[PDB]
Structure 1
Amino acid sequence: VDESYLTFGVLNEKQPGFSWLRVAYGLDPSEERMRLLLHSQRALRNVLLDSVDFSRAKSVWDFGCGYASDIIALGERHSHLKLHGHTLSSEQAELGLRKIEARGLGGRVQVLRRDSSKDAPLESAYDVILGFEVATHIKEKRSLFQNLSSHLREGGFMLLADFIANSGSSYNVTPSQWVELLSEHGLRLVECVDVSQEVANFLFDADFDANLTQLETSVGISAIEKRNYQAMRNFGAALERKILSYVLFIAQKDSHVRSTYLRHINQKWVEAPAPYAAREL
């Protein structure tokens, strides 16, 4: 199944009997729940992507692109965009480019095996940088943000979805560390959107352990898929207990704001993010 089916989504309330695993893998045949799965995932992505006028962008860098679903989708939407993805695995890189060529996106959309904490991307600067749950999988976050910010056009967007570690316990990063990573690299938050409870809702499955075994024995999954799914369940429990938050960061490269003020406005958004529920709907 496509990797986009296995990403987080936002649910406004828990849906009794909804299992993200069963639905994604079609063990639950309901076309209505399949629609809800996809809608919840697009709704999460669109909080970030809807901020950017892509008609004024030339290039996008997804610095941990998985199987390149996100940049393939953007590429089919916006025929003029160069989109470049980075991944650490050769499997994802080969499978991504096979998808890219199957859709005829070979000129504009590329996937490279490059370590975004160290390796420069293809362009000297990008108009948009995407990182959906990438940064907290990277140990050397300062080197990463040095690399991202130096390849972000002035006024360009950095769109992140990632975890914040609260008074509690993957490399998890506290609010101050997020403020310092953004502020010291000239990245100014336009908005932070807190989707913690809605992602917890999406991930909630009272039958997770039994559904995972049914997936193992019926469909067959890899050791790495199984462990990722167990980690996702655990993330949902952490979000419910508010040990972690899951936050959508809309930031821009800004070399002209004063550093003391930049810290202030980044603190405002990390510490008082817009709650997803109050924000729209």
Structure 2
Amino acid sequence: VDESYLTFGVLNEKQPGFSWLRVAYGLDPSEERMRLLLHSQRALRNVLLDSVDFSRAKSVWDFGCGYASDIIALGERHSHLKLHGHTLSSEQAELGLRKIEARGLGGRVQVLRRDSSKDAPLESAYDVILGFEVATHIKEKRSLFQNLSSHLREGGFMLLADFIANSSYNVTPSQWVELLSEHGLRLVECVDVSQEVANFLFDADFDANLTQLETSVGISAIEKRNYQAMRNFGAALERKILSYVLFIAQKDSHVRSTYLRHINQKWVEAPAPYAARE
């Protein structure tokens, strides 16, 4: 089961019989529920990717790329792009290589075993940097954002999907403003998808389905634990303890540091609700 089937998605309403886990693992045979799973996951990614004219981009850096599904998809869609992914796992980089070669993308899509908090990437200035739920797993956040912003083209896009702590490593609204502002990163938009991700994750039969999943399919103690966290994460979004937010930012060395903090505060504290889009 490709990692992309196990990502978050956005659902506008909870669907009474929907279980993301049963559908992703093919345990639910409903063709409509499968198309809903895939659509919701594509819709979440699209909030970020629809901002970028990739026909005018040359290079993309995913600084926590997993099994490289996102850069593989972009590389298949835009044949001219060079895409570089970072992972901390030597084996995960090997699995990503295998997927990349099997799709003929080996010439321009790479996965490197590099620590994005401290290891420079291949290119001096990327057009787009992607991070789907990576920054919250990284302790040295200023070291990370220094490395990211140093290797981002002026005017280049940084596209993040990450969490805000409203009260692993949780980041408060005021901390996000400073992390972005200190590194010359100007938000174009924040989009709050908290409730819609909570809707996607809500599974009234979750514990039953997770057990049923573990006898039918084979899932490791690691995988089981990871899915338990996703369920708990949905509950935290429901309770508004956390927010799940999409950040569309650009490198901007020409805005004043006080004005940069003004406009980043506007978007971090008053993100656009997802339900008001087209």
Shorter-chain TM-score bucket reads over 0.9
Over residues 179-200 of structure 1, what are the superposed CA-to-partner deviations in whole Å (9 max), with x where a residue is unaligned?
A: 0100000000000000000000
Q: Tell me the alpha carbon deviations over residues 214-263 of structure 1, each in whole angstroms, 9 at most, x when there is no partner.
A: 11111011122111101100100000000000000000000000000000
- The DSSP-based 3-state class of the residue aligned with 1:93 is helix
Runs of 4+ in structure 1 over 3 Å off: none
Percent identity for Structure 1 against Structure 2: 100
Aligned counterparts of 2:152 and 2:135: Cα–Cα separation in 1: 16
State the 1:53 CA deviation.
0.5
Q: What is the alpha-carbon distance in structure 1 between the residues aligned to residue 208 and residue 131 of structure 2?
A: 32
Which residue does the alignment assign to 2:194?
196
* TM-score between the two structures when normalised by the length of structure 1: 0.98
Hey, what does 1:99 align to over in structure 2?
Answer: 99
Task: Give 1:240's aligned residue.
Answer: 238
In structure 1, stretches of 5+ residues that fail to align are none
SS for the counterpart of 1:255 is coil
> Alpha-carbon deviation of 1:91?
2.3
CA distance in 1, matches of 2:139, 2:95: 25
Partner deviation per Cα, 1:89-123 (whole Å, 9 max, x = no partner): 12221111101000000010000111000100010
CA positional deviation for 1:278: 1.2
Deviations 1:43-65 (A, max 9, x none): 00000000001111110000000
Q: Between 218-227 and 261-270, report the one with greater CA deviation.
A: 218-227
Measure the CA separation in 2 of the matches of 1:91 and 1:20: 27
SS state at 1:205 partner:
coil
SS of 1:14 mapped into structure 2: coil
Q: Distance in 2 between matches of 1:179 and 1:225?
A: 33
Measure, in 2, the Cα distance between the counterparts of 1:50 and 1:69: 17
Once residues 226 and 163 of structure 2 are traced to their aligned partners in structure 1, the CA distance between those partners, rounded to angstroms, is 16
Count residues in correspondence: 278
2-structure distance, mates of 1:223, 1:67: 19
Residue 279 of structure 1, CA deviation:
2.1
TM-score, length-scaled by structure 2: 0.99
CA deviations on 1:157-178 (whole Å, 9 max, x unpaired) are 0000000000xx5111000110
Alignment partners' CA distance in 2, 1:256 and 1:234: 41
For the pair 1:269 / 2:264, whether they are aligned, the reply is no
Match of 2:205 among 193, 204, 207: 207
**Bigger shift: 122-131 or 215-224?**
215-224
Partner of 2:117: 117
Deviation at 1:127, TM superposition (A): 0.2
- In structure 1, the partner of 2:141 is 141
C-alpha deviation, 1:210, in angstroms: 0.8
Structure 2: tracts of 5 or more residues without a match: none
Output the aligned Cα RMSD.
0.6
C-alpha distance in 2 between matches for 1:87 and 1:214:
31
